[PDB]
């Protein structure tokens, strides 16, 4: 009854928030570091930083962020 509640409020009320910053938290830089491309210029440093700009701009699209609070919502109505 209340983590399931609890998880719907955090869809409904703060899920678009807080895809929002899991979207703008990525950092490109720190993410073509670990795939070993970039260091903490070259330039498959600088094309992975600009295919992970636009991976995040992908999960920015009304679709994909709608489809990921669906998700999850489905999930939180399977919390007993």
Same mark, same amino acid.
């Given at each position: 009854?209340?983590?399931? %509640?609890?998880? =719907?409020?955090?869809?409904?009320?703060?899920?678009? %928030?807080?895809?929002?910053?899991?979207?703008?938290?990525?950092? @490109?830089?720190?993410?073509?570091?670990?795939?070993?491309?970039?260091?903490?210029?070259? @330039?498959?440093?600088?094309?992975?930083? %600009?295919?992970?700009?636009? %991976?995040?701009?992908? !999960? =920015?699209?009304?679709?994909?962020?709608? =489809?990921? !609070?669906?998700?999850?919502?489905?999930?939180?109505? =399977?919390? @007993?």
């Amino acid at each position: 009854a209340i983590v399931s %509640m609890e998880c =719907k409020t955090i869809v409904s009320q703060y899920g678009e %928030m807080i895809w929002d910053l899991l979207v703008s938290g990525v950092r @490109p830089d720190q993410v073509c570091s670990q795939a070993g491309l970039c260091f903490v210029e070259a @330039p498959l440093c600088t094309a992975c930083e %600009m295919a992970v700009v636009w %991976m995040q701009n992908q !999960l =920015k699209q009304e679709g994909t962020k709608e =489809k990921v !609070l669906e998700y999850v919502n489905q999930l939180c109505e =399977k919390i @007993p």
